[PDB]
């Protein structure tokens, strides 16, 4: 629902579970860009910042722009203002309260970081309790983000076959994170969606109610 959760279920960074590892970089393995602190928008979405080209967040100890660096989106957790709302046939969803420009950072897909054994146990539990909402995305061959038991606002974004947001996997201080980014200009009040079918995991598949002209008919089917 759209009520404030118990605080322990709202997490701000990914939460490793059980045997799952997270990784850290030596600062010498982190790319350093050529932007200047005096630039109009140092390391911004229109810049030529090499870190952005590599989908690597600038490290705050390293980047020449320092505190003017605009390529620290994941670490700073400054997200466009959003709100949870009830849809007609797709449960709860997420909509922006502010205009968002094409390519802008919308949110990080934050959740519990689990391995495949744990993910199987959670899907089997969902099967036994008739749970029909899933919040799992593949991070890599060993790790899955599950924003179901804990997460942030991104867990409420619904699926669309012709969405207005996309996932991008970035490197942040030596480990991978999933960011959501606008595919186009989005007006305030618009529901935020992405295409689940590239990376999602769940209990089988379910009929898609996105209603897009190109609708492929299902959530849960690799294209």
Ligand X SMILES: *Sc1cc(O)c2nc(N)sc2c1
Ligand Y SMILES: C[S@@+](CC[C@H](N)C(=O)[O-])C[C@H]1O[C@@H](n2cnc3c(N)ncnc32)[C@H](O)[C@@H]1O
Ligand Z SMILES: Nc1nc2c(O)cc(SSc3cc(O)c4nc(N)sc4c3)cc2s1
Q: Which residue has the tokens 């919040």?
A: 135
Q: What is the 3-state secondary structure (H, E, C) of the chain?
A: CCCCCCHHHECCCCEECCCCCCCCCCHHHCCCCCCCCCCCCCCCCCCCCHHHHCCECCCCCCCCCHHHCCCCHHHHCCCCCEEEEECCCCCEEEEECCCECCCCEEEECCCEEECHHHHHHHHHHHHHCCCCCCCEEEEECCEEEECCCCECHHHHCEECCCCCEEEEEEEECCEEEEEEEECCCECCCCECEECHHHCEECCCCEECCCCCCCCCCEECCCC
Segment contacting ligand Y (CB under 6 A): 47-55, 74-82, 106-114, 205-213?
A: 205-213
Query: Under rule CB under 6 A, which residues in 170-199 are in contact with ligand X?
Result: 196
Segment contacting ligand Z (CB under 6 A): 123-131, 146-154, 204-212, 215-223?
A: 146-154
Pick from 56, 105, 134, 156 the residue near ligand X by CB under 6 A: 134
Q: 141 touches which of ligand Z, ligand Y, Ca ion, none (CB within 5 to 8 A by kind)?
A: Ca ion
Q: Does 55 bind ligand Z (CB under 6 A)?
A: no
Pick from 42, 80, 151, 163 the residue near ligand Z by CB under 6 A: 151
Q: Does 164 bind ligand Z (CB under 6 A)?
A: no
Residue 90 is labelled as binding a ligand: yes
Q: Does 208 bind ligand Y (CB under 6 A)?
A: yes
CA gap 29, 222 in Å, rounded? 34
Shortest approach of Ca ion to residue 108 CB, angstroms?
A: 23
Identity of the residue, 57 or 191, whose beta carbon is nearer to ligand Y in the bound complex? 191
Shortest approach of ligand Z to residue 120 CB, angstroms?
A: 20
Identity of the residue, 49 or 192, whose beta carbon is nearer to ligand Y in the bound complex? 192
Q: 113 touches which of Ca ion, Zn ion, ligand X, none (CB within 5 to 8 A by kind)?
A: none
In the structure encoding, which two tokens stand for residue 200, read together?
């999602």
Interface residues toward Ca ion, by CB under 5 A: 48, 141
The order of strands in the sheet holding 200-201 is 15-16, 112-114, 143-146, 136-140, 200-201
Query: Under rule CB under 6 A, which residues in 121-160 are in contact with ligand Y?
Result: 132-135, 155-156, 158-159
Q: Does 91 bind ligand Z (CB under 6 A)?
A: no
Residues of this chain that interact with ligand Z (CB under 6 A) are 2-5, 9-10, 84, 149-153, 155
């Amino acid at each position: 629902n759209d009520k404030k959760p118990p605080p322990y279920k709202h997490i701000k960074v990914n939460r490793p579970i059980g045997r799952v590892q997270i990784f850290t970089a030596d600062l010498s393995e982190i790319p350093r860009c050529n932007c200047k602190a005096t630039d109009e928008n140092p390391c911004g979405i229109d810049s030529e910042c090499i870190n952005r080209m590599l989908l690597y967040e600038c490290h705050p100890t390293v980047c020449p722009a320092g505190g003017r660096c605009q390529n620290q989106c994941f670490s700073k957790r400054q997200y466009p203002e959003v709100e949870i709302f009830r849809t007609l046939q797709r449960g709860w969803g997420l909509r922006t309260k502010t205009d968002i420009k094409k390519g802008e950072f919308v949110n990080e897909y934050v959740g519990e970081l689990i391995d495949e054994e744990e993910c199987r146990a959670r899907i089997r539990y969902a099967q036994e309790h008739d749970i029909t909402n899933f919040y799992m995305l593949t991070l890599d061959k060993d790790r899955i983000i599950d924003a179901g038991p804990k997460g942030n606002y991104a867990r409420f974004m619904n699926h669309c076959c012709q969405p207005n947001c996309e996932t991008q996997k970035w490197s942040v201080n030596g480990d991978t994170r999933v960011g959501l980014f606008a595919l186009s200009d989005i007006k305030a009040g618009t529901e935020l969606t992405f295409n689940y079918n590239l990376e999602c995991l769940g209990n089988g598949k379910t009929v898609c109610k996105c209603g897009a002209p190109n609708c492929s008919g299902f959530l849960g089917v690799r294209p």
